[PDB]
Amino acid sequence: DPDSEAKKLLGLGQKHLVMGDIPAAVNAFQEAASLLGKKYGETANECGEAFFFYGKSLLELARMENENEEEEIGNLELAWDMLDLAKIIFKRQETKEAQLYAAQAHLKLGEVSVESENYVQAVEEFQSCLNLQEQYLEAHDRLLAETHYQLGLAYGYNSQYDEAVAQFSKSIEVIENRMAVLNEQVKEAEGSSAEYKKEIEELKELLPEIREKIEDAKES
Amino acid sequence: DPDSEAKKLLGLGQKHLVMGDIPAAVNAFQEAASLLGKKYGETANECGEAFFFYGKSLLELARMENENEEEEIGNLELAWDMLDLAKIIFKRQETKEAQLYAAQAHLKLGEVSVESENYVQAVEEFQSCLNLQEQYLEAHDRLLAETHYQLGLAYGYNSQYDEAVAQFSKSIEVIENRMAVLNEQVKEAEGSSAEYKKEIEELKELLPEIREKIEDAKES
Ligand SMILES: [Ca+2]
Ligand SMILES: [Ca+2]
Ligand SMILES: [Ca+2]
Ligand SMILES: [Ca+2]
């Protein structure tokens, strides 16, 4: 497709994320975002992912810079603009994957809000994320624990300490319930592994008897 | 249901199978078979399982007895009669589970034929079983290996030694391919178990940081 030229940069940015080269991932994402936005418009489905990653990287790029104060300010305003576009694009689409992306955009909007000492807005954004996730995730999904934790943090920054304690406790509850589920999955996987190993041994000790029957049939 | 009185004996027979008490399993199966046959007729779906198990047990009961020669003869003729009824009942029904039961009835008809020094008929029955199984089983199902092996045996008893070698080799091929598949399943199960254990450890080392944040929020 003609978009490939930009999807390339989507890779080369995400690569740099796992590389830790931030301003390079920023430039990659910016170029891909500019390409897709010029082609398809400012609100197109085609730009959702692009605008999100650009936004996310910008947030990281303002975190690195911690009198260069207007630098991180401008990076955070742009992070916000891009993530909000992303959030609109995602929330429009009626599929579980898009809604969870929208929740992710909300989560990063909350993180940008936190980095701006804007804790009330942070609380609103994390709540929006949690609301979306509770419709589509299982009650022990790690993501819910991480959202509760972020929400509790934001509450604390705003001195709403009882609300903060409540969210921290919910986070702990999810983490413990997930640990239980994972323990069950371990027991199951190891049981199956034992079953298969035992059958393997049975088959192995069957083979040479058959081979001797072949030998005996040939000499007959 | 009113059949429960007989389904009881279906359990009490199968129990005795895993107990090794054969003539007791025979009497249990015979009583259940008589009950179901009186109620529903000689060819009813309701009697399939019953007539099969009776048949199978009778075969075992004639295997134990190895001038009491008419004893095992009569047990084998009855085994045959019951298993053939079972086979008709199963083959009539157009579902995978019933067809595989029909293949099982064929397999036991082949075994009765072998115990009667009737190797041509044995070959026919094992072939019927294999034909049914190759429509519904994966190419590495243990059952196919066991059928090929039984077929190869029957061939050998009838001095068709090249056919016998062919079937033995097919049996070996299935056993080796199954061993491969099981090895892959082991690798997968153990990989998953490692993943889950690692996530468990991460969650465990997350918990006390959250707990300290709760403590700090309360004292605030
Ligand atoms: Ca603005
Ligand atoms: Ca030998
Ligand atoms: Ca007869
Ligand atoms: Ca402390």
Swiss-Prot record, chains A, B:
TM region positions: none
GO BP terms, alphabetized: blastocyst development; CENP-A containing chromatin assembly; DNA replication; DNA replication-dependent chromatin assembly; male gonad development; nucleosome assembly; protein transport; response to testosterone
Subcellular location as annotated: Cytoplasm; Nucleus
Coiled-coil regions listed: 165-220
Name used for this protein in its record: Nuclear autoantigenic sperm protein
Part of the intact protein present: 38 to 659 of 788
Keywords: Acetylation, Cell cycle, Coiled coil, Cytoplasm, DNA replication, Isopeptide bond, Nucleus, Phosphoprotein, Protein transport, Repeat, TPR repeat, Transport, Ubl conjugation
Cellular component terms (Gene Ontology): chromatin; cytoplasm; nucleoplasm; nucleus; protein-containing complex
Renumbered ranges of TPR repeats: 6-39, 103-136, 145-178
Assembly information from the UniProt record: Binds to linker H1 histones. Interacts with histones H2A, H2B, H3 and H4. Interacts with histone H3.3. Interacts with histones H3 and H4; NASP is a histone chaperone that stabilizes and maintains a soluble pool of histone H3-H4 dimers. Interacts with ASF1A and ASF1B; the interaction is probably indirect and mediated by H3-H4. Also binds to HSP90 in the cytoplasm; this interaction stimulates binding of NASP to H1-6/H1T.
Tissue: Isoform 1 is testis- and sperm-specific.
Gene: NASP
Job description of the protein: Component of the histone chaperone network. Binds and stabilizes histone H3-H4 not bound to chromatin to maintain a soluble reservoir and modulate degradation by chaperone-mediated autophagy. Required for DNA replication, normal cell cycle progression and cell proliferation. Forms a cytoplasmic complex with HSP90 and H1 linker histones and stimulates HSP90 ATPase activity. NASP and H1 histone are subsequently released from the complex and translocate to the nucleus where the histone is released for binding to DNA.
Gene Ontology molecular functions: histone binding; protein-containing complex binding
Annotated family: Belongs to the NASP family.
